[PDB]
Structure 1
Amino acid sequence: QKIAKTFTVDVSSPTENGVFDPASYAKYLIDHIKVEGAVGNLGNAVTVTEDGTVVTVVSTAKFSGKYLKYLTKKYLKKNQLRDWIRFVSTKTNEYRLAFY
């Protein structure tokens, strides 16, 4: 009914090399997460908290990891970080960014 799921993104690795901005990544998610098909309709249903090494999303509305991958891959292409960063899931809802 009102159960909340927590999605964590480990952005620790690419932030030291200077090619990634963790603060902007949380900002990007806020504006573009669609909740019943609307941007900005995140009326406390979802919440993106960023602390410099990990970005967490807590949602009671519809949300899935395959959506979060879609938005993250949207951002890296937008900023030309593709073929340099991969969105990878280490385990369930424990996604991580790989630089290699």
Structure 2
Amino acid sequence: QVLKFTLDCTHPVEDGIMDAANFELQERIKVNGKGGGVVTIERSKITTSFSKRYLKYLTKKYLKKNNLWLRVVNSKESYELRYF
């Protein structure tokens, strides 16, 4: 009934090429087009509701926004950022 996705970002954060402070999604994730407490974000890695590929699309949009050399790929309900 509850869908969870992680979308880890350890590698670019550790190298300091980008901070995990601007990414944590709240202002861009669309629910029913435009959604209350229906979905939630648990920043740490991030985390709850939905399409995972929507998260991949938003992550690539963020990478293009910050000129980020990086690749969104890791396990079910989990995306990872890794270098080429």
- TM-score, structure 1 as length reference: 0.79
Give the Cα separation in 2 of the matches to 1:76 and 1:48: 19
Give the whole-Å Cα distance in 1 for the aligned partners of 2:32 and 2:22.
24
Q: Percent identity?
A: 46
CA RMSD of aligned residues (A): 1.0
CA distance in 2, matches of 1:91, 1:17: 22
**Shift in Å at residue 99 of structure 1?**
2.3
Match of 2:40 in 1: 47
* 2:78 counterpart letter in structure 1: E
Q: Are 1:97 and 2:81 counterparts?
A: yes
**CA distance in 1: counterparts of 2:59 and 2:9, whole angstroms:** 11
| Residue matched to 1:69 | 56
Unaligned runs of 5+ in 2: none
How many residue pairs get aligned? The number is: 84
Q: Which has the higher contact order (CA 8 A, sep 6+)?
A: 2
Report what 2:16 is aligned to.
18
Q: CA deviation at 1:75?
A: 0.5
| Higher strand fraction (1 or 2) | 1
* 4+ residue segments displaced more than 6 Å: none
Structure 1: where are the runs of 5+ without partners? none
Give the secondary-structure state (helix, strand or coil) at the position aligned to 1:13: helix
- Secondary structure in structure 2 of the residue aligned to 1:48: coil
